[PDB]
Amino acid sequence: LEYSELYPIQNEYRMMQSLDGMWKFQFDPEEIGKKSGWENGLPAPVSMPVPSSFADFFTDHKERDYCGDFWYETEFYLPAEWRNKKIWLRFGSITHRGTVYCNGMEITSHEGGFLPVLADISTVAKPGQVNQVVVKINNELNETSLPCGATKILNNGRKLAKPYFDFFNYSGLQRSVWVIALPEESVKDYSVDYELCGTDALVKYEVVTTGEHPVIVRLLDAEGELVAETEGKEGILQVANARLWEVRNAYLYQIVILITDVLDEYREKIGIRTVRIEGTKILLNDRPVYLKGFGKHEDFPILGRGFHWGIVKRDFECLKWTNANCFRTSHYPYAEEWYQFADEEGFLIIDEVPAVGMMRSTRNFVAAGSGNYTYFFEALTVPELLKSHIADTEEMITRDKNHPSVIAWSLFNEPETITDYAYEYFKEVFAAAETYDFQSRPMTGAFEKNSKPELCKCYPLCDFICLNRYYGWYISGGPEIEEAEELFRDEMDRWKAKELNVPFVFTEFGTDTMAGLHKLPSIMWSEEYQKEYLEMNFRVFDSYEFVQGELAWNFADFQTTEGIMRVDGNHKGVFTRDRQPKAAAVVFKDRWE
Amino acid sequence: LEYSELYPIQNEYRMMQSLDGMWKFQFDPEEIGKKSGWENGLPAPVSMPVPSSFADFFTDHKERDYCGDFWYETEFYLPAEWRNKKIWLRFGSITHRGTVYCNGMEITSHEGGFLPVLADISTVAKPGQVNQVVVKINNELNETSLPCGATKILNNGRKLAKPYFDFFNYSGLQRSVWVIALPEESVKDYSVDYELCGTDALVKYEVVTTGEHPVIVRLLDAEGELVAETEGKEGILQVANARLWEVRNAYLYQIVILITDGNGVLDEYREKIGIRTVRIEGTKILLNDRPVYLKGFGKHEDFPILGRGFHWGIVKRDFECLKWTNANCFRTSHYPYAEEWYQFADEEGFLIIDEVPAVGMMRSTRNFVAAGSGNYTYFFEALTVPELLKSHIADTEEMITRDKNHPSVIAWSLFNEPETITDYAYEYFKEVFAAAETYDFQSRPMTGAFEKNSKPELCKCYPLCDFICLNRYYGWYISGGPEIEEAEELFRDEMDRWKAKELNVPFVFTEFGTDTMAGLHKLPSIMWSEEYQKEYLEMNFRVFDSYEFVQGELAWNFADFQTTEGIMRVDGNHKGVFTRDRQPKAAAVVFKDRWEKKNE
Ligand SMILES: O=C(O)[C@H]1CNC[C@@H](O)[C@@H]1O
Ligand SMILES: O=C(O)[C@H]1CNC[C@@H](O)[C@@H]1O
């Protein structure tokens, strides 16, 4: 990379200052901003909270559904003491594409709206004065960046996003923004890997700095006492009587990285843990673990994908209530704070890159069950798609690798995988992913039903196999649910017959469920049917030895593109959007207990 | 006040650092925290978001409904650069009571859960190091502080809050927390007052500092250019062709206060203010000498999961909805809101009735129905009334000192629905109004909201008010449904009695509404349906428009909000015109159409 992905901290060597609050905001429908010098300040702005998605604040269609260029602006005072430091703007994310300006100068551009953006403003920053940042953002959708979709142009010239994915195209500055000051020679990146040796543990590490001075690495336990110390950008910390990080029983050490001439110090909490695939088993610290939990979303009323600690608190309290131990970051990397808390709460995370919508369809959720092939990986643009896919894969892994909670990388969700065009594509992604991960932890992806065991060319790439199946909803279901169970067992029997000796994890299954809709006997959208559907699925899961995980879809109701198949978003949630349990929630709780 | 109510800013002289995030948290039911040394750190904490209310996070009754002592803890790094400055911990609020500890030392205690708490940690802070904050908080209810209520003890010994008011007892650290650094000689407070002169305006000001050095005051326009400059802690800025701050058309000047020692600047404070006058003349409410008709809502700091936790996103959405209904005003029921509400109201040009938490001054754990009903509870005859008065006046001073310079704040509400039919009540509020008047440099209109028991024949407290705020529920609590025609006549009868008194003061209806289930449709209407909400409002509109001295209508409520659970509250109060998720019910359009045209 060309910047540090590390989470900002505050010490004697590093400073940070928040830019969160009310920013200036202006739509640029005619796209004349750059021509008109908006990079020096917006001419007629409104107020916009940062962090948040902008869409749900407004009361008119034009603004909520805005697609194209729009601008942010704010001012901030730089402390005079920040002089002669490397000064960076750190955006938690810019969705989807952006150009950062500071004091009139173009600093950097970024592609991908769910990972941090860093802008080196050292030479242009004015310490001891008020400074200006202006950001030009674009939220269009294409097939050359993630996530994939299309942008429709109406006859008045207004643009409209047409996703190939099933969630609303929220955008803006949805995560916290910092200005930070680093020493001229600094810790840029680090990596840990773990090995268990009886009661001892080895922490293999790697450190990348912006200079050549010696590096000291210390490991402190939860109370701050030194347990290991090494020198070098590569080495091994030896921990006697290591207190291992356990599922729903976390222990966190604090790693301390020092550049000495001290020139720089970085601290971060980590957990000693191993993850391995052996046969059909997923081994955490050598003991088989069964994944229980949900696919989630960064989604909440009014805030959109805007981060807030309160959402995290309620969501984890609910997870623990259902006795879950895992969730997948569908369908994109979350705000860094989610992983930090998962580390402390002892939750497992399948970390997913935004590789969703790689099958050309504007109502993809039902097109996944009919095998109509869209020639997606045969397009003239896929080299661009692959490059940005690998880029997002790199940024995610560099960012999240040192979290103990992250046990696997999901590198796609429901793409076309039945041709060799697809295989050659993902062969590259998997190769790249393994290169970026210091731990080489399990790599997988979520397959849709179209990827028949007889046709799929991509599952051999996976360390374990994640299936999204909706036998009971999109396939048969309702009156035909007994046929759905027969069809479901039939596909699993075919997978079993392959004798792959790899773990299978169901990463999606569910039914849209209206809070309050009761029916006796049950009907598809009712609360009772959600329960009956789950119990049928549970029966199938328990019929196969190599099934080692069940992640239900979804944790909570979330916002989608409006259409004839989405009644105010997606209602396959087990909890409502306001985080209250439907009837089927206790079914998970009793089972997972 | 022995601290600066001023909102923290960042410049060459002042520094600030946010303490928001995940704090450590622990309930203290046996109330053994201090004796066990929790002030040095909590022994077995959980994680807790700041800012937020704690109640809605948990999944069990015992924790959601917790009443008593509970603790917060966090750590923070102090820049070495802050050495030899005055360092303060600034809580937006601590609900309801608190003692702040820093690095093991007791710093300060505070009573009142809706106004800033400032704790001077200058002598205990350790620059260049990690520092520790611990807060002991209590959220019980009594009759010696605001808001009023009782604390019930269950059979198992667990405490339970029993409010005399109709909103849930959210508590904790519900607003932003800062650590800030000030110069040793600093601006502690200032006040502005305005006088209009044709096309010109005067800005009268007063400045309070912690020292004796000269003060320079500058006034900048919205483009940052100088329009006036004078020197001295008291003085007048003269503005030619003044751009007045107007309703739904705000213009904000920036005032700049400088402490100079003449070879340098010792301190600088900036704030946006609006040139505006507010006055009562006869039955008219005059903004910039123009009679204005108040249109809007009573609100609540209330949102799913967050409780009363502040968030800019809530503010943005709520103001977009307000502008959509063509409102120009809202009341901060029943407590001062987070400061950011006022800042944005200044920018959006909304009028604000700023209300102190003097709610629940009638002993009843079912107060919303105990109204209209004529039961006297001897509330102001208790031996605790002197102590209640002290904290009431204390909250008033803090509120007024904090919000006085906001152009949006046009009036102070000093109570909501107390007992007012005895001289005990009169003597009580006479003190409050007197105190309130001394604290306000502008001496703007002062009022309170009267409930129906405060009959025109019996009420002793309305003469204290510059204008009169009435909460009435004719066609809900009184003769609702089939009897709505009887409701209208009863309403006209009371207004006729008020009219007959020839008081020559403005009357403002600060509450009226019906509980309304989103989705409940009925033809013909029934109470609780969306259609009835519409019909109820229109009967009320007819009565409102029948009296010239009626100069404002604030519907109750802007949005559905959380209350104590009971047989009359279906998941809180549903008199909202919007849902709790901020989406409009059918009656929202009714206001939009009326307020679009309704003026004067
Ligand atoms: O249809 C559904 O509910 C799901 C199907 N597969 C992908 C998800 O994003 C989508 O939301
Ligand atoms: O009954 C009601 O809905 C209202 C009556 N007057 C006071 C409010 O706090 C209360 O919520």
Side-chain angles (χ1 to χ4, degrees), chain A residues 13 106 117 151 187 193 205 234 248 302 323 325 340 485 494-495 574-575:
Chain A
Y13 319 89
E106 180 165 339
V117 180
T151 292
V187 183
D193 194 1
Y205 74 85
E234 294 183 349
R248 286 298 304 280
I302 305 306
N323 301 309
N325 63 16
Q340 298 170 3
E485 184 174 349
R494 288 183 270 138
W495 281 113
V574 161
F575 291 81

Side-chain angles (χ1 to χ4, degrees), chain B residues 202-241:
Chain B
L202 303 187
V203 184
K204 314 174 191 177
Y205 74 87
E206 266 185 12
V207 175
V208 177
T209 74
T210 63
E212 295 304 323
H213 283 94
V215 171
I216 295 183
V217 181
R218 297 182 185 150
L219 197 63
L220 314 180
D221 60 18
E223 302 293 338
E225 282 232 309
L226 182 63
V227 306
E229 188 173 354
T230 192
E231 187 279 334
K233 292 189 175 183
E234 297 105 27
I236 298 184
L237 302 157
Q238 293 177 337
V239 184
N241 298 318

Side-chain angles (χ1 to χ4, degrees), chain A residues 475-574:
Chain A
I475 294 92
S476 296
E480 308 182 343
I481 190 182
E482 285 175 340
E483 179 201 38
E485 184 174 349
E486 292 157 354
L487 290 174
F488 195 2
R489 302 182 171 278
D490 183 273
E491 190 196 352
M492 295 313 294
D493 286 346
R494 288 183 270 138
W495 281 113
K496 182 187 184 179
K498 292 180 145 294
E499 297 291 351
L500 286 177
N501 200 35
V502 298
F504 276 64
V505 166
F506 292 98
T507 38
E508 279 184 31
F509 59 98
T511 58
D512 286 59
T513 304
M514 277 295 150
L517 179 53
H518 298 287
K519 264 294 197 307
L520 178 65
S522 70
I523 59 174
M524 267 161 92
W525 284 71
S526 74
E527 294 199 21
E528 294 78 15
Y529 185 84
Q530 194 181 30
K531 301 180 62 182
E532 297 166 356
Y533 167 87
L534 289 173
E535 279 164 5
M536 175 270 286
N537 278 262
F538 293 153
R539 285 196 304 271
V540 177
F541 297 171
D542 297 339
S543 300
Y544 300 93
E545 46 288 335
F546 53 79
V547 175
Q548 293 293 339
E550 47 193 67
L551 306 185
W553 188 259
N554 187 278
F555 167 74
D557 300 337
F558 58 91
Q559 199 60 251
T560 63
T561 305
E562 48 182 306
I564 59 183
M565 292 177 129
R566 287 293 179 262
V567 191
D568 185 24
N570 187 304
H571 284 265
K572 293 195 182 63
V574 161

Side-chain angles (χ1 to χ4, degrees), chain A residues 375-431:
Chain A
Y375 305 82
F376 186 84
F377 287 104
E378 304 187 28
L380 167 150
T381 52
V382 313
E384 204 182 327
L385 182 64
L386 178 57
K387 182 205 63 66
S388 62
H389 189 166
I390 293 179
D392 287 342
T393 301
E394 180 179 9
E395 298 176 40
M396 175 186 65
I397 292 183
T398 303
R399 177 198 180 247
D400 300 338
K401 56 185 172 184
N402 297 327
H403 290 288
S405 49
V406 179
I407 63 175
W409 312 108
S410 186
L411 299 177
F412 56 84
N413 185 85
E414 304 181 345
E416 288 185 347
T417 66
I418 58 181
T419 65
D420 296 296
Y421 295 99
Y423 174 79
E424 292 299 328
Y425 179 95
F426 287 107
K427 185 182 182 62
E428 295 292 341
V429 176
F430 277 74

Side-chain angles (χ1 to χ4, degrees), chain A residues 10-12 17 22 47 49 56-59 77 81 302-303 308-310 313-314 317 341 344 578, chain B residues 10-12 17 21-22 47 49 56-59 77 81 305-306 311-313 316-317 320 344 347 581:
Chain A
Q10 187 161 332
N11 55 34
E12 178 175 353
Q17 172 176 322
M22 278 301 211
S47 295
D56 285 344
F57 291 133
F58 303 107
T59 59
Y77 182 84
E81 300 76 3
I302 305 306
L303 297 193
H308 194 79
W309 273 118
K313 182 61 182 182
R314 176 62 178 183
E317 288 305 307
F341 200 67
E344 162 179 15
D578 283 352
Chain B
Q10 184 100 331
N11 53 35
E12 178 176 353
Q17 172 178 322
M22 275 300 210
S47 294
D56 285 344
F57 289 132
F58 305 107
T59 60
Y77 179 83
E81 304 71 301
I305 304 306
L306 297 192
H311 197 282
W312 272 119
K316 182 61 182 181
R317 175 60 178 181
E320 286 304 307
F344 201 67
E347 161 178 14
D581 280 351

